[PDB]
Amino acid sequence: YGDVAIVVYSGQYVENGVKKNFLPDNTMVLGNTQARGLRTYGCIQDADA
Amino acid sequence: MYTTAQLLAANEQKFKFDPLFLRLFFRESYPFTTEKVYLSQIPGLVN
């Protein structure tokens, strides 16, 4: 769309017994692809580990 | 008897028929040895 990249997301997930889209009906997010996130994972609370 | 008939070419009247399904969705064929079949659909909905 000029400088901004346009996507349409439709991913779903299954709650207890039914499915549902991740997003509600009408959301619009201004974001930057270069923005840095964190996949951080804590320490496994397991004696065996 | 004495008519002297000469024959020309003969039109065929071909009948149009194209599957468009067996070669578009049913590309695979399986023979039978048994008398029935079983079809399994595995519903995977993890929470």
PDB file of C-alpha atoms in Angstrom:
ATOM      1  CA  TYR A   1       0.000   0.000   0.000  1.00  0.00           C
ATOM      2  CA  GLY A   2       2.854   2.318  -0.891  1.00  0.00           C
ATOM      3  CA  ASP A   3       5.189   1.993   2.080  1.00  0.00           C
ATOM      4  CA  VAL A   4       3.099  -0.051   4.530  1.00  0.00           C
ATOM      5  CA  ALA A   5       2.654  -3.790   3.967  1.00  0.00           C
ATOM      6  CA  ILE A   6      -0.932  -5.065   4.111  1.00  0.00           C
ATOM      7  CA  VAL A   7      -1.802  -8.520   5.457  1.00  0.00           C
ATOM      8  CA  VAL A   8      -5.035 -10.293   6.378  1.00  0.00           C
ATOM      9  CA  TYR A   9      -4.848 -12.728   9.295  1.00  0.00           C
ATOM     10  CA  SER A  10      -7.357 -15.519   9.881  1.00  0.00           C
ATOM     11  CA  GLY A  11      -5.683 -17.927  12.308  1.00  0.00           C
ATOM     12  CA  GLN A  12      -7.919 -19.893  14.657  1.00  0.00           C
ATOM     13  CA  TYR A  13      -7.496 -21.829  17.888  1.00  0.00           C
ATOM     14  CA  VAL A  14      -9.638 -24.403  19.670  1.00  0.00           C
ATOM     15  CA  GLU A  15     -10.830 -23.607  23.177  1.00  0.00           C
ATOM     16  CA  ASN A  16     -12.317 -26.257  25.486  1.00  0.00           C
ATOM     17  CA  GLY A  17     -14.757 -27.630  22.923  1.00  0.00           C
ATOM     18  CA  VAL A  18     -15.069 -25.157  20.049  1.00  0.00           C
ATOM     19  CA  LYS A  19     -12.903 -23.153  17.668  1.00  0.00           C
ATOM     20  CA  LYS A  20     -12.580 -19.393  17.355  1.00  0.00           C
ATOM     21  CA  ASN A  21     -10.522 -16.850  15.458  1.00  0.00           C
ATOM     22  CA  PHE A  22      -7.609 -15.292  17.313  1.00  0.00           C
ATOM     23  CA  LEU A  23      -8.742 -11.823  16.425  1.00  0.00           C
ATOM     24  CA  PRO A  24     -12.132 -10.252  17.124  1.00  0.00           C
ATOM     25  CA  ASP A  25     -14.314  -9.014  14.278  1.00  0.00           C
ATOM     26  CA  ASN A  26     -12.592  -5.768  13.263  1.00  0.00           C
ATOM     27  CA  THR A  27      -9.086  -4.924  14.448  1.00  0.00           C
ATOM     28  CA  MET A  28      -6.458  -2.770  12.784  1.00  0.00           C
ATOM     29  CA  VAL A  29      -2.864  -2.757  13.985  1.00  0.00           C
ATOM     30  CA  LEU A  30      -0.182  -0.256  13.019  1.00  0.00           C
ATOM     31  CA  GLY A  31       3.066  -2.144  13.523  1.00  0.00           C
ATOM     32  CA  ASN A  32       6.663  -2.280  12.368  1.00  0.00           C
ATOM     33  CA  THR A  33       8.279  -5.476  11.125  1.00  0.00           C
ATOM     34  CA  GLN A  34      11.641  -4.350  12.520  1.00  0.00           C
ATOM     35  CA  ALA A  35      10.231  -4.092  16.050  1.00  0.00           C
ATOM     36  CA  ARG A  36      11.978  -6.614  18.279  1.00  0.00           C
ATOM     37  CA  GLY A  37      10.058  -9.092  20.413  1.00  0.00           C
ATOM     38  CA  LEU A  38      11.051 -11.702  22.963  1.00  0.00           C
ATOM     39  CA  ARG A  39      10.348 -15.448  22.826  1.00  0.00           C
ATOM     40  CA  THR A  40      11.651 -15.713  26.386  1.00  0.00           C
ATOM     41  CA  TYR A  41      11.325 -19.035  28.200  1.00  0.00           C
ATOM     42  CA  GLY A  42      11.757 -19.491  31.936  1.00  0.00           C
ATOM     43  CA  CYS A  43      13.478 -22.246  33.871  1.00  0.00           C
ATOM     44  CA  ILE A  44      11.818 -25.663  33.707  1.00  0.00           C
ATOM     45  CA  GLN A  45      10.609 -26.386  37.249  1.00  0.00           C
ATOM     46  CA  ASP A  46      11.425 -30.086  37.063  1.00  0.00           C
ATOM     47  CA  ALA A  47      13.795 -32.031  39.299  1.00  0.00           C
ATOM     48  CA  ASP A  48      14.375 -34.609  36.569  1.00  0.00           C
ATOM     49  CA  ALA A  49      15.329 -31.866  34.110  1.00  0.00           C
TER      50      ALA A  49
ATOM     51  CA  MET B   1     -30.824 -52.951 -60.845  1.00  0.00           C
ATOM     52  CA  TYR B   2     -29.609 -50.197 -63.170  1.00  0.00           C
ATOM     53  CA  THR B   3     -29.469 -47.122 -60.916  1.00  0.00           C
ATOM     54  CA  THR B   4     -25.657 -46.714 -60.627  1.00  0.00           C
ATOM     55  CA  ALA B   5     -25.417 -45.117 -57.190  1.00  0.00           C
ATOM     56  CA  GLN B   6     -22.102 -43.598 -56.084  1.00  0.00           C
ATOM     57  CA  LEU B   7     -21.521 -42.995 -52.375  1.00  0.00           C
ATOM     58  CA  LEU B   8     -19.943 -39.892 -50.849  1.00  0.00           C
ATOM     59  CA  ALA B   9     -18.509 -39.347 -47.372  1.00  0.00           C
ATOM     60  CA  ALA B  10     -20.578 -40.044 -44.259  1.00  0.00           C
ATOM     61  CA  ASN B  11     -21.025 -37.672 -41.336  1.00  0.00           C
ATOM     62  CA  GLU B  12     -20.428 -39.286 -37.949  1.00  0.00           C
ATOM     63  CA  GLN B  13     -22.571 -37.216 -35.538  1.00  0.00           C
ATOM     64  CA  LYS B  14     -20.122 -37.426 -32.649  1.00  0.00           C
ATOM     65  CA  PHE B  15     -21.518 -36.981 -29.140  1.00  0.00           C
ATOM     66  CA  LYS B  16     -19.620 -34.607 -26.859  1.00  0.00           C
ATOM     67  CA  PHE B  17     -18.478 -35.969 -23.492  1.00  0.00           C
ATOM     68  CA  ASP B  18     -15.552 -34.855 -21.326  1.00  0.00           C
ATOM     69  CA  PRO B  19     -15.136 -36.110 -17.730  1.00  0.00           C
ATOM     70  CA  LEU B  20     -13.490 -33.052 -16.131  1.00  0.00           C
ATOM     71  CA  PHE B  21     -13.842 -34.802 -12.767  1.00  0.00           C
ATOM     72  CA  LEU B  22     -12.018 -38.140 -12.917  1.00  0.00           C
ATOM     73  CA  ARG B  23      -8.940 -36.255 -14.150  1.00  0.00           C
ATOM     74  CA  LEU B  24      -9.489 -33.220 -11.892  1.00  0.00           C
ATOM     75  CA  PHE B  25     -10.417 -34.684  -8.500  1.00  0.00           C
ATOM     76  CA  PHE B  26     -10.457 -38.477  -8.880  1.00  0.00           C
ATOM     77  CA  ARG B  27      -6.916 -38.893 -10.209  1.00  0.00           C
ATOM     78  CA  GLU B  28      -6.465 -42.015  -8.052  1.00  0.00           C
ATOM     79  CA  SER B  29      -8.243 -45.348  -8.509  1.00  0.00           C
ATOM     80  CA  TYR B  30      -8.330 -48.328  -6.171  1.00  0.00           C
ATOM     81  CA  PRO B  31      -9.361 -51.919  -6.927  1.00  0.00           C
ATOM     82  CA  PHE B  32     -11.369 -54.104  -4.577  1.00  0.00           C
ATOM     83  CA  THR B  33     -10.793 -57.539  -3.140  1.00  0.00           C
ATOM     84  CA  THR B  34     -13.295 -57.234  -0.303  1.00  0.00           C
ATOM     85  CA  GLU B  35     -17.007 -56.421  -0.555  1.00  0.00           C
ATOM     86  CA  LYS B  36     -17.186 -53.041   1.219  1.00  0.00           C
ATOM     87  CA  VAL B  37     -14.923 -50.134   2.144  1.00  0.00           C
ATOM     88  CA  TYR B  38     -14.152 -48.111   5.250  1.00  0.00           C
ATOM     89  CA  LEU B  39     -13.565 -44.353   5.269  1.00  0.00           C
ATOM     90  CA  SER B  40     -11.862 -42.804   8.292  1.00  0.00           C
ATOM     91  CA  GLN B  41     -11.979 -39.107   9.196  1.00  0.00           C
ATOM     92  CA  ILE B  42      -9.878 -38.216  12.245  1.00  0.00           C
ATOM     93  CA  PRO B  43     -11.138 -35.038  13.985  1.00  0.00           C
ATOM     94  CA  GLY B  44      -8.157 -33.237  15.452  1.00  0.00           C
ATOM     95  CA  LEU B  45      -9.210 -30.337  17.692  1.00  0.00           C
ATOM     96  CA  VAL B  46      -6.577 -29.841  20.376  1.00  0.00           C
ATOM     97  CA  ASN B  47      -7.283 -27.363  23.155  1.00  0.00           C
TER      98      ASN B  47
END
